[PDB]
């Protein structure tokens, strides 16, 4: 039993604050601790095998806990497993039954031109595998395409994920812009998916769409995680 | 500005300890009073004009706080309010923006038969207007048409409600089957709509799909108030 969870590979000075974006950390750590718990084995990989953190999600309101603890612990079966971050080429989709696309703003640069992951995703669930993403993670969506009807995978399909009211809120939606990209709602929209949104941009909220998972935050990584295990049952 | 928040008229002995069921309690008080804090006004109507409680949702683990306290309480609001409940015949669909379906499992005695209110809330919805339904609540949709497509109002659309696993764990499925029930899972097959599921059957989850609104259980009746509201403008 393996899944696959995919991380952003771009980690460059992001916020008004001189933050640099990247992979949010418990969009990481809550799906794999999720996955490692049910008993599947986990595979990072990147885009270009490597990633840096979102900085933002490095403060103290986001990772806390038993997280922070299994963060800083370089011996942690998390830290150990990410050492073994794969790049496309060193993966074999076959070996997969969950595509797990974590987040970050930083999915919103790579993931929509991420094809040789779009091809692993396709061939995952085309051999009946659950295809999840939390977040930002609907972005690899944007030209992901079904092999076996040629249609975009999300085409008539119902999900949900980070809102554009969310960007606002935290105030980059002049950045989003500013470097010409596109939102999980406008993606949605661009291929003909149903854009389901929470009641609240933060709360934790999931959608179950048959073999399709997917999230709308940090908040919703375990939800999203714990539907993507479910799910293969459909 | 007004809202119509029908009520099952249903108030037979249903469980298993010869308890009856009819309303549950918070599913029409919670709605009710997010309605009226918004600055809605509300009419209470049901098939007969008369509706009793179901005898589960009056423990302590579902009524209590100011719940309770608003429920014993003869001169709230609310209990006012539900004292002038008035039938369909009585009810000018256009004097409506919403229509909200409490329930409680009397509903799949009487939702499914009741024309005349399917008829009110095709016409608000006709002009407009929003449609939400909690819990057992969806079973009004079973024959509910599109004023202005002809098709099954819920058909294509995308929905959720009190989930068939949950009618096990309540011990209740035999009953159903035995009295001849429809569950909403059913009716959403029925009419060719799609049902989302939550992670947990007693999970408050919802979702809004254009001016249709759905809950799955009473947990889920305030943020289905709230998603029919912010609807309006959908």
């Known amino acids: ?3 696959l969870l995919a991380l952003t590979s771009y980690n460059d000075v992001f916020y008004s604050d001189g933050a640099k974006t990247g992979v949010f950390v418990v969009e990481a750590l809550h799906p794999f601790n999720t996955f490692r718990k049910e008993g599947f084995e986990v595979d990072f990989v990147s ?14 309101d986001f990772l806390n806990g038993q997280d922070e603890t299994d963060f800083k612990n370089k011996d942690s079966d998390f830290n150990k497993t990410l050492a073994k971050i794969k790049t496309p080429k060193e993966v074999n989709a076959d070996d997969y ?35 999840a993403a939390v977040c930002h993670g609907p972005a690899i969506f944007d030209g992901l395409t079904d092999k076996k009807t040629g249609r975009p995978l999300i085409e008539g399909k119902s999900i949900t994920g980070f809102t554009d009211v969310g960007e606002t809120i935290l105030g980059v939606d002049s950045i989003l812009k500013a470097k010409n990209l596109a939102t999980v709602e406008d993606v949605a929209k661009k ?33 999203t995680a714990v539907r993507s295990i479910d799910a293969l049952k459909n």
Chains 1, 2 share one sequence.
């Open 47 to 60: 885009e270009t095998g490597k990633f840096g953190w979102d900085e933002h999600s490095l403060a103290k």
């Open 191 to 223: 291929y003909g998916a149903k854009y389901l949104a929470p009641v609240g941009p933060w709360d934790d909220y999931s959608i179950t769409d048959g073999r399709l998972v997917t999230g709308v935050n940090p908040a919703s990584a375990h939800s």
């Open 97 to 131: 039954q969950i595509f797990f696309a974590s987040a970050g703003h930083g999915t919103l640069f790579d993931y929509p031109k991420a094809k040789d992951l779009q091809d692993i995703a396709s061939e995952i669930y085309a051999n009946g595998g659950v295809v």
């Open 1 to 3: 039993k393996k899944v």
